[PDB]
Amino acid sequence: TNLVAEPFAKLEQDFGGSIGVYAMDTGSGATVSYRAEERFPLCSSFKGFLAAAVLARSQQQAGLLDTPIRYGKNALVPWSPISEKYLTTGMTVAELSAAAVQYSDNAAANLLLKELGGPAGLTAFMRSIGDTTFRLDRWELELNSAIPGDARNTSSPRAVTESLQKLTLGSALAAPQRQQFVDWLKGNTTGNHRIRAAVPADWAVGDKTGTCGVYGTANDYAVVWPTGRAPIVLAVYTRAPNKDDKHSEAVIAAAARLALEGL
Numbered sequence: 001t002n003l004v005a006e007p008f009a010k011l012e013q014d015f016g017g018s019i020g021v022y023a024m025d026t027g028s029g030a031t032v033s034y035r036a037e038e039r040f041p042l043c044s045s046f047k048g049f050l051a052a053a054v055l056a057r058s059q060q061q062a063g064l065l066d067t068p069i070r071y072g073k074n075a076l077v078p079w080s081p082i083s084e085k086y087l088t089t090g091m092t093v094a095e096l097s098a099a100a101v102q103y104s105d106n107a108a109a110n111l112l113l114k115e116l117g118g119p120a121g122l123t124a125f126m127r128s129i130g131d132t133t134f135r136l137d138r139w140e141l142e143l144n145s146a147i148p149g150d151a152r153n154t155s156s157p158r159a160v161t162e163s164l165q166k167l168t169l170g171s172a173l174a175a176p177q178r179q180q181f182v183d184w185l186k187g188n189t190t191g192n193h194r195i196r197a198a199v200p201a202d203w204a205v206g207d208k209t210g211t212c213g214v215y216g217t218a219n220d221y222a223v224v225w226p227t228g229r230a231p232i233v234l235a236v237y238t239r240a241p242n243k244d245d246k247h248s249e250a251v252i253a254a255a256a257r258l259a260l261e262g263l
């Protein structure tokens with residue numbers, strides 16, 4: 001049997017769907033794993049990796065992050081609260097990246113995808129850092145459909161955590177770019193009820209959320225710095241069988257608590 005898994009199984013049964021969890025202590029190598037290699041929809045959570053892919057490009061393209069993008073109304077899509085405010089002035093690539101990560105701005109994400117050569121360009125970046133699981137093939141809003149058994153626009157909790165560790169703590173980005181990615185994640189505004197609700201208040205957190213909403217689908221991944229300790233990387237993804245099944249931020253927080261307790 002798996003006694004470590006039993007509280008996760010009870011949580012997902014009460015939720016009425018499936019929860020996927022992977023957590024690793026980067027100091028000790030201790031892990032907590034529940035459905036860690038199953039696929040779950042990415043939803044908005046792809047935007048963290050998008051920002052990292054833009055930072056990687058910015059190492060070789062002088063002034064890329066400083067470049068003003070002067071987009072029109074045709075670039076705007078629902079839930080673009082930051083992009084709606086700069087139609088006459090524009091935003092720099094850095095500002096679009098911050099908006100995509102910290103407000104989950106959809107127009108900003110589509111403008112940055114265009115920079116990379118679309119969803120195929122982001123998937124190619126993820127392959128370049130050793131992630132064979134990540135798949136993205138749609139723009140906002142089509143990537144959010146989250147239909148059960150559709151492997152498009154999915155990854156696994158384990159592959160998300162492994163890629164997050166490479167980009168935030170490892171050598172996949174040069175140090176100035178690694179630091180910018182960490183700072184964007186630390187400044188996220190959309191995750192206060194998810195992994196952040198599970199961590200002691202004094203611990204530093206960087207995270208990116210995803211909320212397809214349909215089929216009980218939502219997620220969060222984070223780098224967590226416990227006071228005086230090596231960082232923890234973790235991912236919590238959910239899905240459910242019925243289209244009208246509601247996501248739960250409380251279930252994500254609860255799964256994150258069990259992960260931290262299990263390390």
Ligand SMILES: *C(=O)N1C[C@H](NOS(=O)(=O)O)CC[C@H]1C(N)=O
Nearest residue numbers: 043044079104190209210211212
């Ligand atoms: C991301 O999944 N989305 C963007 C936005 N919410 O941001 S969140 O992911 O940080 O919660 C609206 C929901 C969703 C979308 N349909 O694009």
